[model samples]
Target chain A: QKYLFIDRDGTLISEPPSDFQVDRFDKLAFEPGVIPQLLKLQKAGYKLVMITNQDGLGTQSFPQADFDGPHNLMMQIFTSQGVQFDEVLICPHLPADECDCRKPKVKLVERYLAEQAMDRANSYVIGDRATDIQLAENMGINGLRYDRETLNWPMIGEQLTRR
Target chain B: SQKYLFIDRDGTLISEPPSDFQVDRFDKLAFEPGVIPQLLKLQKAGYKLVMITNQDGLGTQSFPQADFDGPHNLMMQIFTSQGVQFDEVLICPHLPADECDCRKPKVKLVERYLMDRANSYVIGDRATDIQLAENMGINGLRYDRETLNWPMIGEQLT
Candidate 1:
């Protein structure tokens, strides 16, 4: 199966202009037109995978407990809407941690696909940041950012379809 | 058993046709200087030769596939006659807008036919080829008509 690795914050939800963090459950607001687009993509043979960086999730700045409640709430919403994620991978360590699973590294993606019976070449990574594009590069796959090139899902799908 | 010498065909092997970019003429096919000898030497040195190229006019009426046949056959004949051979020839036929994975810089083909990447190398005339080398974690050697020869491509980069 082809995978679509979507970034969590600033992509599926809003990001504050500066130093924003999605540490609260109430902060998990869906970006407009994205959920339905994701559902449509799942119907179109895309296995949705969530890849995010919650750098401070394990640190004192953002406790894992505070993060999980809202994160689980979002999952519940996804399940309620008849959609689901095939897998979810998060990097909780700070950038100083030098962890391998962070964005722009393929270690997590490598481990994610190592045992899975899926089509690797057809994969794509969608996010709102440059690191998301770098992740795709790191994995040697295609990537698209929400604001960098085009607008909305259909246009994005049209571009990916050509790929 | 797994060292690969990934090479570009159009500019690196045969010169760009008189019309340029897309090579659609069988009569215009010609090898770059000493390419055959260098490829022969590299193959003897245990590097598995692989041709990586993008043919824009493929499977379409604009650039008929039949036209490519005689030139490819002739090209291979020349290589084989000289005892030089490519283990694999990967061709991406997608148009410019179609960003297919088989195209250069996309590691799909290399990933599928993964060799000892640390020991492998990419030889081409474009920056994308270097990106492919980086993507595959291998060395890249840029070959151009002005400053590159086939032997230089086969050299052990230090």
Candidate 2:
């Protein structure tokens, strides 16, 4: 069985403006067609995972409780929409701190694969930045880079399925 | 005597003044005519060469200190490729108005060197270079492109 790792902000959900604390649950919004795409991937026998870097929450630059509220709301929205994820891994360290688990670091991804008894070679990660590609490369797994201009989910899904 | 040879960076090595200079970017610096050969000869003569520079560009808020790294790397690469080595590079990244002790004519940096090595000399084409050496109680040699008899002074170094 193949596993698909999707990035949270910008890739799966619409990034909130200003990146301040999201005190209200009503502020959360998913990217267009993300719910349906995730459900279809789940039905096709693919184990979905969410990997995100959430440093602002830890830094208190944004209130932790306030950030957690919207993130929890997003999880609830995904669940109610039949978008099931096997696991959601978050790295709370800032980029400059050089933590082992932060994006471009494969510590969290490797842990997930081991805990889930998943074959890393057959897994693929989809993220927007070069860090995502580097992380997947570190794990010897395939990576797909998605950005505002590309928006090619169908081709990405097909590639992931073949893996 | 194993004397220290203090050299200025700009016209001595490259074709520009030291001020308002950006390394590897805005400043298009190249070695002066016959400088590489002279440097090679100096190295063979067992002189401990060091670059004493005032890089006020580093002190300015607009320019980053990291930008200095580019020119520094380029200098080392060139010198190493030519089989010449420098003892050390001392840079004072302070503006003249800041009243920094290390600025040329202050003799602070030169005094620090003298405390360790008494035999030393300063060479440059600028007036501040001569004043710096005079303040430090060391011999200063000033030269210009029109006057190329620097070897006569070198002969008197014994």
Candidate 3:
């Protein structure tokens, strides 16, 4: 089965405030048309997955429970909108922590595939930054970047549609 | 009559031999900075440019065939991409020691061109270029890097 790995923050969700506390789950806002697009992708037989890096958690800059609150809320928002994600993977280590799970490192994606017995060759990682693409390349999977300025979902979908 | 401009590859188009290292990589064959604009000017002036390079290393088996092919293909691609069309590329792969009449300072190639076209010019950056033009009984424009003008001192060919 083909997997579509999506990135959170600046991709699917709105840019959080600098003083943003993940503990305030109610403050989380997603970009418009994200839920409908996810629903369309799901109905088309794509297995949605979310991959994110939350460095604040590992640094104790934010409470561990604080991170979980928003994540849980995001899941609920997607589910309630008829968008079902097959899996969610988050890297909580700060860059200085030098952990393997951080993005630009494919260990987290690899771990998920290994646990699920999935074929990585058929999967794609979609995100807004170069790190996302680097991670996908590391895993030998296709990577696609999102351009918020263009508001072009069709272009992104076209890249994913190709093998 | 359509005029053809036959340029000597080394020394003329590129740096001279010994000092002019053979381009081995795609990146290396990139035209000498302003060469593209100069070629575009020549193209607009209605001149059919052709490369007549003497790759003595290839004929003498001094350099591997694979080494030349990459650079040659890259050169062609760069020219074509810029809309600069080269009618032909005639390479003489004999070493200087071979003493072949087909080598520069000889008019064999010019004679071949004359059979097809009445008007043509040999723009070479070496002494051999001027000598070959004399042998062909045609006008040879010696490209002088220092003077930036044709350095032929003798009478104009009739």
Candidate 4:
């Protein structure tokens, strides 16, 4: 099946300018019209998947409690707005950890890529980083760079629906 | 004498994390004291082991299925490595308010196992488990984390 490998911080919500971490409720700000666009994409038969990298998550530097509060609230808000992701995958490793499951590694999503009926041609990786595009290359699917200026979520949603 | 040991997961086999009440993290995955040794003893005594658990809102955002799968599979692998194997595992993923018939104290998940109930037991930390044993017409061994433990239960059973 087709899927949209959406990013969390920048693509779905405004990336926090201070530390690029939306660790608190006050730090969260949704991208313009993200919920409606996501609802449209879901209605278009595209599965929404949130893939993100949070360095030192579940560590003393950034405890799981800190991540869980904001992250679960994000999910709760999305669910309330009729936007539910099919899967949410987080890479909680720091770059120093050298974990193979980190974004651009394709290790965390090996199961999804191995799906017998996975429509790679239609599956698109939508994110705010070049690494996310590289992840698309690694996974052998399309990529939509979401930098807001060049490409916003509404545009991506509309583009995918048109296909 | 063929006997069965229907065991609980959280707070019985493993320490239930007080923070989230779910053993879904590696840090939260510590086993109950004496569980491994006692379970090994019980299995050695020819009792078939079965695991029955209630994981609230599993597959939902609150308790995503992927998050639960990792820790649970790791738990099973650890048990297997210690030469412990559960003959069957029954999990009711719905919340109690959902009122699913398969939850503990409701025998839908284990009704077939009641054919030969001689010496069978339901071991858990909750009263619902004891109630499940009563409903199943088997023995209930209330395993208190502080007072009663696996060693005592193993001694009584074996």
TM-score of each: 0.47, 0.45, 0.45, 0.50
Candidates 3 and 4, the one with greater TM-score: 4
Give one digit per residue, the lDDT tens place, for model 1 in A69-151.
Answer: 65765565465344578788888878998998888887767765575655668888999899999998877678888762365
Clash pairs for candidate 3? none
lDDT of each: 0.73, 0.65, 0.63, 0.81
lDDT string, candidate 1, B30-137, tens digits:
567657646756877888889998888587887777777656765675465445778888888888788777787888887777578778889998898888899888
Worst 10 residues of 1 chain B by lDDT: B149-158
lDDT of 3 at A154: 48
Question: Could you tell me how far off, in angstroms, the CA of residue A152 lies in candidate 1 after the best superposition?
Answer: 67
Best by TM-score: 4
- Is model 1 an incorrect, acceptable, medium or high docking prediction? incorrect
In candidate 1, the residue pairs with backbone N, CA or C atoms under 3 Å apart (3 or more residues apart, or in different chains) clash, namely none
**Candidate 2, TM-score vs. the true structure?**
0.45
lDDT of 4: 0.81
Off by over 4 Å in 1: A1-163, B155-158
- The predicted structure with the larger lDDT, 3 or 4, is 4
Candidate 2 C-alpha error for residue B121, in Å: 99
Query: What is candidate 3's CAPRI-style docking category based on DockQ?
Result: incorrect
Output DockQ, candidate 1.
0.01
Scanning candidate 1 chain A in windows of ten residues, the lowest lDDT window is: A24-33
Candidate 4 lDDT, tens digit per residue, B1-158?
56899999999988788888876664455567667657878988988899999998888889898778766775675466445789988999998889999988899999788644778999999999999999999989899967888878879887
- DockQ, candidate 4, comes to 0.01
- Name the better of 1 and 2 by lDDT: 1
